[PDB]
Copies of this chain bind each other. A is one copy, B any other.
Amino acid sequence: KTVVVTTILESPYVMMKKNHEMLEGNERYEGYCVDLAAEIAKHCGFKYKLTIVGDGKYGARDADTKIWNGMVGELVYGKADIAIAPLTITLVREEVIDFSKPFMSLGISIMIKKGTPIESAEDLSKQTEIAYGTLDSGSTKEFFRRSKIAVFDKMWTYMRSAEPSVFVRTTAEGVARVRKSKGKYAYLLESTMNEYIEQRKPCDTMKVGGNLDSKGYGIATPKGSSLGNAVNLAVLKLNEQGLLDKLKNKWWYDKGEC
């Protein structure tokens, strides 16, 4: 059967083509994950349909309802067959879905408006003037919620209680907030997205300091799926054949505007 792929509109992973209204099906979209999906499909020998996740979220479990939302929910509830997206491999997710070996490494990082007097997480934690926050429903928020590290625990205590809310619905919303806030908001997001935006006009943001953690994005499938083995082997093959490095360069740096 045609494989339903869940993914997310997150630049430069998946983006609407300029002329998408004139195009159909998989041809409407472009990006790193669009190129990657085509290759995974070709190597595993399946036909597929790209679908954008309905609720626009990565995936988290409701503490009260126990229901998973986002791409993770679409796999868990059988709405999609595979997720090919910047979907972070985490323990709580690996308990309900399967991940390939990672196709990209990343860590949480700090985005500032250029000139913001912050160099580190410690810096953010030791001051009050500059607000800071995360994507409201992903792995970055969870990192802080769970961290027993002093600096990060202090940051979480501030973020969970800050008013108005320092959390954002989408990555684009976080980036826009840094850009419009005259240095008074810094955004905590994955190094991959941080480094992409740093190379986009109007070239007014910067990644500062080291990454806070180390993790990976993986291709996810419902637990027990017949696709998992082949998908994993394809990721390894594509890495070893240099495709992943090629795709990174194509979408990050070949298209740099700064």
The answer to whether B148 touches A90, judged by C-beta atoms less than 8 angstroms apart, is no
Residue A89 lies at the interface, judged by CB distance under 8 Å to chain B: yes
Residue A213 lies at the interface, judged by CB distance under 8 Å to chain B: yes
Residue A11 lies at the interface, judged by CB distance under 8 Å to chain B: no
Q: Tell which of A102, A147, A218 has the most Cβ of chain B within 10 Å.
A: A102
Which residue from chain B places its CB closest to the CB of A240 in the assembled complex?
B91
Say how many copies of this protein the assembly contains: 2
What 1/0 mask marks residues of chain A from 206 to 221 whose CB sits below 8 Å from any chain B CB? Answer: 0000000111101000
Known A232-B94, A236-B94, A240-B90: A101·B146 in contact at CB below 8 Å: no
**Overall SS of chain A's interface:** mixed
Chain B hits for A241, CB < 8 A: 148
Residue A242 lies at the interface, judged by CB distance under 8 Å to chain B: yes
What 1/0 mask marks residues of chain A from 60 to 103 whose CB sits below 8 Å from any chain B CB? Answer: 00000000000000000000000000000111001100010110
Residue A244 lies at the interface, judged by CB distance under 8 Å to chain B: yes
How far apart are the CA atoms of A135 and B241 in the complex, in Å?
21
Residue A55 lies at the interface, judged by CB distance under 8 Å to chain B: no
The answer to whether B146 touches A90, judged by C-beta atoms less than 8 angstroms apart, is no
Give the distance to chain B from A82, nearest Cβ to Cβ, in Å: 18
The answer to whether A242 touches B101, judged by C-beta atoms less than 8 angstroms apart, is no
Give the distance to chain B from A94, nearest Cβ to Cβ, in Å: 6
The answer to whether B240 touches A146, judged by C-beta atoms less than 8 angstroms apart, is yes
The answer to whether A236 touches B101, judged by C-beta atoms less than 8 angstroms apart, is no
What 1/0 mask marks residues of chain A from 226 to 258 whose CB sits below 8 Å from any chain B CB? Answer: 000000110011011110110000000000000
How far apart are the CA atoms of A127 and B105 in the complex, in Å?
33
Chain B hits for A143, CB < 8 A: 240
Give the distance to chain B from A211, nearest Cβ to Cβ, in Å: 10
Chain B hits for A176, CB < 8 A: none
Known A148-B242, A242-B148: A237·B101 in contact at CB below 8 Å: no
The answer to whether A233 touches B94, judged by C-beta atoms less than 8 angstroms apart, is yes
How far apart are the CA atoms of A239 and B212 in the complex, in Å?
12
Give the distance to chain B from A111, nearest Cβ to Cβ, in Å: 21
The answer to whether A214 touches B90, judged by C-beta atoms less than 8 angstroms apart, is no
Q: Pick the contact of A102: B90, B102, B147, B233 (CB < 8 A).
A: B102
List 9 A-B pairs, minimum CB-CB distance, nearest first: A91-B236, A105-B105, A91-B237, A91-B240, A149-B242, A94-B236, A89-B101, A91-B233, A94-B233
- 7 CB contacts below 8 A, A to B, read A89-B101, A90-B240, A94-B101, A101-B218, A102-B216, A213-B242, A214-B244
